[PDB]
Amino acid sequence: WQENKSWNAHFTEHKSQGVVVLWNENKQQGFTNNLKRANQAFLPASTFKIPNSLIALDLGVVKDEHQVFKWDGQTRDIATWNRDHNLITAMKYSVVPVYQEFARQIGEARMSKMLHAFDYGNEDISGNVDSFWLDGGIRISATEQISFLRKLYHNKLHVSERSQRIVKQAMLTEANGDYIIRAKTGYSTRIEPKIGWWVGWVELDDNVWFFAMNMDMPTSDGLGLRQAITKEVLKQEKIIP
Numbered sequence: 001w002q003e004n005k006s007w008n009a010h011f012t013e014h015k016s017q018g019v020v021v022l023w024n025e026n027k028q029q030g031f032t033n034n035l036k037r038a039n040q041a042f043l044p045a046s047t048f049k050i051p052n053s054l055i056a057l058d059l060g061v062v063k064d065e066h067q068v069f070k071w072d073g074q075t076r077d078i079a080t081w082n083r084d085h086n087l088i089t090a091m092k093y094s095v096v097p098v099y100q101e102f103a104r105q106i107g108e109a110r111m112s113k114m115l116h117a118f119d120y121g122n123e124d125i126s127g128n129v130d131s132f133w134l135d136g137g138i139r140i141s142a143t144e145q146i147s148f149l150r151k152l153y154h155n156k157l158h159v160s161e162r163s164q165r166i167v168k169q170a171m172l173t174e175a176n177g178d179y180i181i182r183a184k185t186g187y188s189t190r191i192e193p194k195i196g197w198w199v200g201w202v203e204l205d206d207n208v209w210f211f212a213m214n215m216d217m218p219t220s221d222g223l224g225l226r227q228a229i230t231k232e233v234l235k236q237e238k239i240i241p
């Protein structure tokens with residue numbers, strides 16, 4: 001692991017504080033601007049949608065990426081949530097109430113066993129079965145997110161290959177002729193400190209760069225900084241143009 005404090009300039013530029021962690025898969029080398037915060041464990045918030053999706057698929061709670069989960073008719077503050085969703089759009093718009101129903105159907109015993117099998121964070125699901133990743137006991141650091149994502153990339157988690165392929169499809173965020181980004185955002189607001197997350201990886205022709213970032217996020221107005229700061233780091237390190 002190497003520390004590169006120069007990336008702090010990207011946070012300071014936006015009056016922010018946080019951490020970016022990168023992992024060069026070919027060379028098995030990690031880089032970060034803050035080795036302490038890189039290993040600080042936070043609520044995963046919606047980044048938990050990655051393991052939750054895997055478990056739901058593997059237990060048949062979700063049949064496939066086309067199955068429709070009908071809106072329950074309750075109007076919520078995020079407009080995109082007030083409609084029917086499949087796994088692809090529920091990941092895209094981070095639709096909490098769809099995933100809350102998954103978790104209830106999964107149930108606490110199976111949720112706990114799967115997170116242990118995944119070696120996920122502190123493996124603690126204390127709290128409500130349908131909100132613990134938002135206001136319960138589960139904590140994961142940026143470097144632990146990378147360990148988890150690497151197993152997913154390699155199809156090494158303790159679920160079927162199909163489940164892992166479908167979730168990686170549903171993580172698709174950006175692609176062009178230079179790179180592919182598979183990732184998931186998160187925003188933890190229920191418990192302090194409020195933080196934003198972005199975790200995933202960048203696929204190149206001949207390498208994969210895993211990343212996990214979090215940043216202090218006192219208001220929703222800075223959420224776009226999650227991707228913008230990560231991309232400034234990726235550009236500085238010549239991973240993306």
Ligand SMILES: C=C(C(=O)O)[C@@H]1OB(O)c2ccccc21
Pocket residue numbers: 044045046047093094096185186187188223
């Ligand atoms: C949409 C979100 C994002 O882009 O990060 C966010 O995901 B969750 O952490 C989450 C939970 C409740 C409300 C919003 C969110």
